[PDB]
């Protein structure tokens, strides 16, 4: 159930931000950035993922399109794990991402 | 809440991926097992039955072991589009 609760919570957060206004199935990059920075504030990159992390977060600043769907939102979460979670420290898999 | 949730998604991946071999990879069979056991209560919505079935069959047919964390999480996302009521009317056909 732990994964059930976790996945339910990831959809909850998406609904919170996407449901603000307009298309309830889409986010702007700015909303996605805000989401990540506020909901995952304590998450910071690991040793060899610092540069990858920064480029990722700058892209969310630069890019200002609003076609971010749920799948892309979740992908961003995955990317943050590869950058900030110690388990993936030595992962020779350069962020997809 | 999101921090706890994302931490838990990694926990589950570690649980399955850490069984043996490459700790950063899963086989499709392991992914299918993971989904079927960890999300047992999740079932498709009205207009997502066919998409759901095709997705779960692909995990049966394909037996490659190149499923990385990103692909694992993508599968979770896909299950949301299929099984979570919020996306019932989502005109976005599973990526997926």
């Amino acid at each position: 159930r732990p994964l059930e609760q976790a996945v339910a919570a990831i959809v909850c957060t998406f609904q919170e931000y996407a449901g603000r206004c307009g298309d309830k199935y889409k986010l702007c990059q700015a909303e996605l950035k805000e989401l990540l920075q506020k909901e995952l504030a304590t998450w910071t990159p690991t040793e060899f993922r610092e540069c990858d992390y920064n480029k990722f977060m700058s892209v969310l600043d630069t890019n200002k399109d609003c076609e971010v769907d749920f799948v892309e939102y979740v992908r961003s979460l995955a990317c943050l794990c590869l950058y900030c979670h110690e388990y993936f420290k030595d992962c020779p898999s350069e962020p997809p991402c």
Side-chain angles (χ1 to χ4, degrees), chain A residues 2-46 48-62 65-93 95-97:
Chain A
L3 190 67
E4 283 180 357
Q5 298 175 231
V7 173
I10 288 172
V11 170
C12 276
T13 302
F14 181 88
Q15 181 199 254
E16 177 171 0
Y17 285 75
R20 280 177 179 176
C21 59
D23 185 342
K24 66 176 176 177
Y25 301 114
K26 299 287 172 59
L27 287 177
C28 297
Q29 294 283 2
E31 292 170 322
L32 178 57
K33 198 205 74 164
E34 175 191 356
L35 189 165
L36 296 171
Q37 290 184 344
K38 288 180 180 174
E39 310 301 340
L40 294 168
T42 66
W43 285 43
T44 61
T46 55
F48 278 86
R49 299 286 161 82
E50 229 137 12
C51 285
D52 305 39
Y53 177 80
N54 296 332
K55 302 175 184 181
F56 174 81
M57 291 298 288
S58 67
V59 167
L60 297 183
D61 272 331
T62 187
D65 294 348
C66 307
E67 291 299 335
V68 175
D69 62 6
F70 182 71
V71 167
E72 184 173 350
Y73 150 75
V74 174
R75 178 175 65 101
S76 75
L77 296 183
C79 287
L80 260 52
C81 287
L82 292 177
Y83 301 143
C84 301
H85 199 288
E86 205 59 25
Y87 185 80
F88 297 101
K89 174 193 175 65
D90 301 323
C91 185
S93 170
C97 202

